[PDB]
Amino acid sequence: WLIKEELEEMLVEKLSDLDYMQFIRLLEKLLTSQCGAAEEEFVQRFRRSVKQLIEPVQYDEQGMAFSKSEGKRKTAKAEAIVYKHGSGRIKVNGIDYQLYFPITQDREQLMFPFHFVDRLGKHDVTCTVSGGGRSAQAGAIRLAMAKALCSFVTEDEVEWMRQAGLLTTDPRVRERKKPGQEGARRKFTWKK
């Protein structure tokens, strides 16, 4: 249903919230009352019309298929290339992942996408992550890997990953400090 502003624009008149609600109730009654074409043609004058983007699969020089993606977490940006076939190796910045991320939490984050779609040990990954700390880098690489793997999993699996939150870019970033207070939300100790 068009908004009160749209209805006002059509009627070149100033309306009220309750007037708009009355009119919308009347139109809804009209819709429910088996409105045919003769009535639907009128009604539609007041109607206003209202999935992951799979990357293309590229091919290297040696003919191996892969998918490239990127993901950002906090200040960390990661570019990940996932090959169609592999032995589960993950090389981050040219270093093996268990060496780059000595933290079990970060290794678990790397695992989370592949483990979810039941493709552990089936894909090789080459990731390059810059900026942020260890955890931000792990999250960015996780997002990039999930997006790249979307090209190799089925559409139902892609939707399941999206529902599990493996393809959403975490918008949580550090909140700026504000003048006159200790931090983003911390206030200076009040002195009654």
């Binding site: 009355q22 109730r25 009347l26 009654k29």
Partner: protein
Amino acid sequence: AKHLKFIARTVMVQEGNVESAYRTLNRILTMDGLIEDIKHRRYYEKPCRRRQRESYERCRRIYNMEMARKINFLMRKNRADPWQGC
């Protein structure tokens, strides 16, 4: 004292639901005004205060009965708006 016992204010429990029996007895006492009478007799209500309270209760009852009559009278008009839109 000089009357027979277990006739006045006595209720018989049905199937052992003493809670239901006590609810029935409490309803009986309240409807007969014994509970309110005991509460008021705990302390001596001087005659002027008693008269004022009785008058206030009478006015309250008149007003409540009239308002209830009005509500019941107008309750039928709670139907769905027949002339909606116009």
